[PDB]
């Protein structure tokens, strides 16, 4: 019962993540930052423009298969 989320970076690159509806999104943020080789707190992760918290889950955010997460530099970063 995974959904696949597409994570889009500042440079238009994509990394997809298969997650459960109950997965704490901290797991995704940490993995993504690791693969980019930057500290996790230098980034902010947005779903439809709203900030994804470590303890948010896809269910709480109303996410579904194929949904996009955008990654921006943290604004006081961070």
């Amino acid at each position: 019962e995974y959904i696949k989320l597409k994570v889009i970076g500042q440079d238009s690159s994509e990394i997809h993540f298969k997650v459960k509806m109950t997965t704490h999104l901290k797991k995704l943020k940490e993995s993504y930052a690791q693969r980019q080789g930057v500290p996790m707190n230098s980034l902010r992760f947005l779903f439809e423009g709203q900030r994804i918290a470590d303890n948010h889950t896809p269910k709480e955010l109303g996410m579904e298969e194929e949904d996009v997460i955008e990654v921006y530099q943290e604004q006081t970063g961070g």
């Binding site: 995974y2 994509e14 990394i15 993540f17 997650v19 459960k20 797991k27 693969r35």
Partner: peptide, 12 residues
């Protein structure tokens, strides 16, 4: 440069 390959990470 070329198109990146597909990248899927499973968070189990």
């Amino acid at each position: 440069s070329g198109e990146a390959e597909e990248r899927i990470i499973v968070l189990s």
